[PDB]
Write a protein that binds this ligand. Structure first.
Ligand SMILES: NS(=O)(=O)c1c(F)c(F)c(S(=O)(=O)CCO)c(NCc2ccccc2)c1F
Ligand SMILES: NS(=O)(=O)c1c(F)c(F)c(S(=O)(=O)CCO)c(NCc2ccccc2)c1F
Ligand SMILES: [Zn+2]
Ligand SMILES: [Zn+2]
Lengths: 261, 261
């Protein structure tokens, strides 16, 4: 039982989930003092991201975020194991302070952040089993800023009203998941970290793309206002807002970059 | 026991100190979304700050920071109650990332931060009894940036190499504590928050001055490198670095500013 606000909020996660007070925690502020260019980092290749429009994919409000299930045929190459997709989900702020990304860059939050979660399918049978094991997970993070209307993100956002409450599910027709990625994916930040939610396992290889994408003011407000953390029938409904973790200490370590300027 | 790094670091404070997981936690990022000018915020008066040069004040390495005791005849006037001084202390980062303020401004961490802690002497007999009481504490924060040498801060820093280890103490001849404050003290941010160390009591009226002061690179390096969290005895010394808390969520709330933007 955990939240992002109140008694069971992030400073208390370590009570029930010891790893939330352990090693390698994410997210972090990405800033120049902890960055080191690594010329060996290569562009990731995204395979099977173009999902068939004749297929459909489950969108679930899980009480903490809205997730879209992704098929294990979607994978990334360019890492030292094949990683296969499991789901994507988002983090955001609130209409009074619409700056809810998890990673920050030079101190600055972006409006929101997409995570595409993959698991090490060379070592592990599925995502759950991978999640608390060495080299288990790889997550792609895309920073989102307010800007132009984004029809690709609308392929998810247009279904939000069908997953308003915890446990509610809706199907989303296949679309090209690559369209959720930015410009010049070749430039990114890379570091070893953790899940940013309980149980906070330090088993995540992060890739945060350097370049943000844009979604409109209206799209971001729709995201921030659409969802609730609680089930329909909860006596005390709670809006799903500010579902991002504060940045963690990141000391005597380095984030590697695929870009040197 | 509590620390800023490892199993007893800040995500685990709420285990021993429940208020660290409660409401009204400090420090925070001070950014436009959550700022509001309040014309009724008047200049504080700093009375008794010109400490007797014929008196000495105890400086102590307490294993968490370096603290200077201050006398109760030093006070702030301007609030609903008189608040009298109890001690001042600093927070800093480390030489590889010399950004260890507690409060941030528009996401920007300053080099270090000075806190001058006061208690409500009208209502309570001393700081320790005031600290878990409503209106109990008022802390002044001065953001510190690397630049020019600061002869006033050296009145404290020149003693650092003499309180290297936990429990060690020096005496500081009285000097004018107002010399530690930045220009235009009438310009500040004001909010209700907490102690930023265990027990994290939500009993602090914060006043963070708008303008930073400067200390030299050499001063900052001495502050970052002089001190240990451990006793002189210890065969496993721990460097007293990165002794700042990460910023806290601050939602549905405002910080009031005595300056307009
Ligand atoms: N931000 S993160 O990518 O570290 C993250 C979440 F924020 C998160 F909420 C989750 S979730 O499992 O609570 C579903 C909500 O999106 C996962 N999941 C990683 C994972 C995937 C499959 C099995 C176990 C863990 C997750 F990886
Ligand atoms: N950031 S802060 O201004 O809120 C702060 C500290 F950082 C700090 F280390 C201390 S400490 O040195 O006393 C030991 C850990 O709490 C206090 N102490 C304020 C205080 C003074 C007298 C009685 C009760 C609390 C304290 F108030
Ligand atoms: Zn996530
Ligand atoms: Zn302090």
């Amino acid at each position: 039982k955990w939240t992002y606000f109140g008694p069971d909020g992030e400073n208390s996660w370590s009570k029930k989930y010891p790893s939330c007070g352990g090693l390698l925690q994410s997210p972090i502020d990405l800033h120049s003092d902890i960055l080191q260019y690594d010329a060996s980092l290569t562009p990731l290749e995204f395979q099977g991201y173009n999902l068939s429009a004749n297929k459909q994919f489950l969108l679930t409000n899980n009480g903490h975020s809205v997730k879209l299930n992704l098929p294990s045929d979607m994978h990334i190459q360019g890492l030292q194991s094949r990683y296969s997709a499991t789901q994507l989900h988002l983090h955001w702020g609130n209409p009074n302070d619409p700056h809810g990304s998890e990673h920050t860059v030079s101190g600055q939050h972006f409006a929101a952040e997409l995570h595409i979660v993959h698991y090490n399918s060379d070592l592990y049978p599925d995502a759950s089993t991978a999640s608390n094991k060495s080299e288990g997970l790889a997550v792609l993070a895309v920073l989102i800023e307010m800007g132009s209307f984004n029809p690709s993100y609308d392929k998810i956002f247009s279904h939000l009203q069908h997953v308003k409450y915890k446990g509610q599910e809706a199907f989303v027709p296949g679309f090209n998941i690559e369209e959720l990625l930015p410009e010049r994916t070749a430039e990114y930040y890379r570091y070893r970290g953790s899940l940013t939610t309980p149980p906070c396992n330090p088993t995540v290889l992060w890739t945060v793309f350097r370049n943000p994408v844009q979604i409109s003011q209206e799209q971001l407000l729709a995201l921030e206002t659409a969802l609730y953390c609680t089930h329909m029938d909860d006596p005390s409904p709670r809006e799903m807002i500010n579902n991002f973790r504060q940045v963690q200490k990141f000391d005597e370590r380095l984030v590697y970059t695929s870009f040197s300027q």
